[PDB]
Ligand binder design. Structure first.
Ligand SMILES: C[S@@+](CC[C@H](N)C(=O)[O-])C[C@H]1O[C@@H](n2cnc3c(N)ncnc32)[C@H](O)[C@@H]1O
Ligand SMILES: C[S@@+](CC[C@H](N)C(=O)[O-])C[C@H]1O[C@@H](n2cnc3c(N)ncnc32)[C@H](O)[C@@H]1O
Ligand SMILES: C=Cc1ccc(O)cc1
Lengths: 284, 283
């Protein structure tokens, strides 16, 4: 987040084998409610990450001849996409900031207009949500749909706000509220997100909130994945990087955002808990 | 004996890469696949942890078709029903592809199957003609079988070199049954095409090519090779960790495993092996 997005894309694909199945289950619940034009239009994926939802989930489910455009503010992610999950003739991985001042000067804008825009687990990394909904509203054809997978609240955000009070850190965390989801302290996340979408010319067709778990088979891939989604590590020097992490990870099982379980085969299971708002809108 | 691959937790470390690989192979063949008007059940033999079924097969299947995935090991068949469980579509059962009494299995009576997928497993089945004959039984006349057999790989040569060690020879007396039969084949595509046609199949397409399995971290590359090591279940604990290091060291000797660099500067870990891809049809 902030300066670029999630660097180190290698550590993030450790959650592919789990995050792929999660969004693949969310989209299956909404895919029947999605209407499509006769002649296909380009489809956009915002905050595509290492391009696994774009390649392994979105692309197999799109109609034939539908071209896909996947963007991410972090370069390292978009280069990881074009090298591993690179799907020729369908997916075109590009760079874009969803709250770009000059959207009309980007490659993604001129690939448009787009029929559908999938914005998955990335709108919590955007402090200015209404500006991001605006730019998505510019990119959609009238009648085009948008699919949101916004994270309402999670213990990772509170662990950020608790660490921001440490004079040890503090200096690097003066803007902690801009690294926290805007629906973190919201008493009604579904209502505020339904109001925000409709306040930008959208027809909210469906909007629900539920808990989610992120499965990890091994112990270290649970740890190494949390290294990537730690948004403050790019500001900390090396002598305190490994200390910011342990301070963070300790404050997580305190807040019970992460957990460890047992398997039917007896093996150890590792989890990450968080709430997700799922939305389906349509431009007028 | 070999009750397939246990420790399913370690195998899903290759899902994030094996999913994209088998997804790429099917895209090269999916145009040549005919489908019936009324859907018939589709079978995935040796499905593993249900990843090349929930995320690869079922998404692109004709709506209304039902998938049946079967492994030989309960641990995998148990991993699927928990994680990659897709109700109303994929059913995960247990089956040995060379079962003496196929007709007494649940998989046999969910059939007959329109299509049968077989990805990276026939190199674990010594009697390959028996497994092809069983696949021929399960298919409807006109059905199609999609094979993904590993012709040769350095994991097998490392096995045959470790069998010569008196340190291990007691556990590795049947080393030729833990090696793909097409390992020492001078023409794997020819033998496989002849094997399929000798069982009533019409080989529509058959190619051989090298493939690569990528792992982003160092230990996921290591922990995955723990699962695909077929001799670890025979070794006592005092020599298990020594058997793995002896295996891993011989792998970079034979250059089956490699390591690379990333555009962002990160380390890349690989596993190299040859794959036969086939598309047959029952008469
Ligand atoms: C935690 S990831 C989730 C990726 C994807 N939803 C998935 O589940 O595979 C959020 C992604 O959105 C990117 N991102 C963060 N902030 C962004 C912004 N303001 N504009 C565009 N992309 C952003 C990040 O670089 C990161 O790759
Ligand atoms: C390494 S996996 C590959 C699974 C899938 N193709 C993939 O790439 O994810 C091969 C699976 O087939 C199972 N298997 C091994 N021998 C078998 C046999 N003779 N019959 C049926 N299944 C077998 C093993 O338990 C193993 O889980
Ligand atoms: C048990 C041997 C083995 C070889 C290749 C593979 O993909 C899985 C297992």
């Amino acid at each position: 987040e902030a300066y670029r997005g999630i660097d180190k894309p290698h550590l993030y694909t450790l959650g592919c084998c789990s995050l792929t199945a999660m969004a693949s289950a969310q989209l299956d619940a909404l895919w029947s409610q999605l209407s499509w034009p006769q002649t296909p239009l380009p489809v956009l994926d915002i905050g595509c990450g290492p391009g696994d939802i774009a390649r392994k989930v979105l692309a197999p489910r799109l109609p034939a001849g539908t071209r896909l455009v996947a963007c991410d503010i972090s370069p390292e992610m978009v280069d990881f996409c074009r090298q591993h999950n690179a799907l020729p003739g369908t997916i075109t991985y590009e760079l874009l900031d969803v709250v770009e001042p000059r959207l009309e000067d980007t490659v993604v804008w001129r690939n448009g207009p787009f029929g559908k825009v999938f914005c998955m687990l990335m709108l919590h990394l955007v402090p200015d949500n209404r500006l991001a909904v605006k730019n998505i509203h510019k990119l959609l054809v009238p009648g085009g749909e948008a699919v949101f997978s916004v994270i309402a609240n999670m213990a990772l955000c509170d662990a950020y706000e608790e660490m921001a009070k440490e004079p040890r850190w503090a200096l690097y965390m003066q803007d902690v509220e801009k690294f926290v989801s805007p629906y973190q302290h919201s008493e009604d996340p579904v209502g505020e997100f339904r109001l925000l979408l409709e306040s930008e010319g959208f027809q909210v067709l469906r909007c629900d909130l539920g808990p989610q778990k992120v499965f990890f088979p091994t112990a270290e891939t649970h740890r190494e994945f949390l290294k990537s989604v730690c948004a403050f590590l790019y500001r900390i020097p090396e002598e305190q990087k490994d200390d910011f992490f342990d301070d963070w990870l300790q404050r997580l099982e305190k807040l019970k955002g992460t957990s460890q379980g047992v398997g039917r085969n007896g093996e150890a299971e590792y989890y990450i808990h968080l709430s997700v708002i799922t939305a389906l809108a349509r431009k007028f």
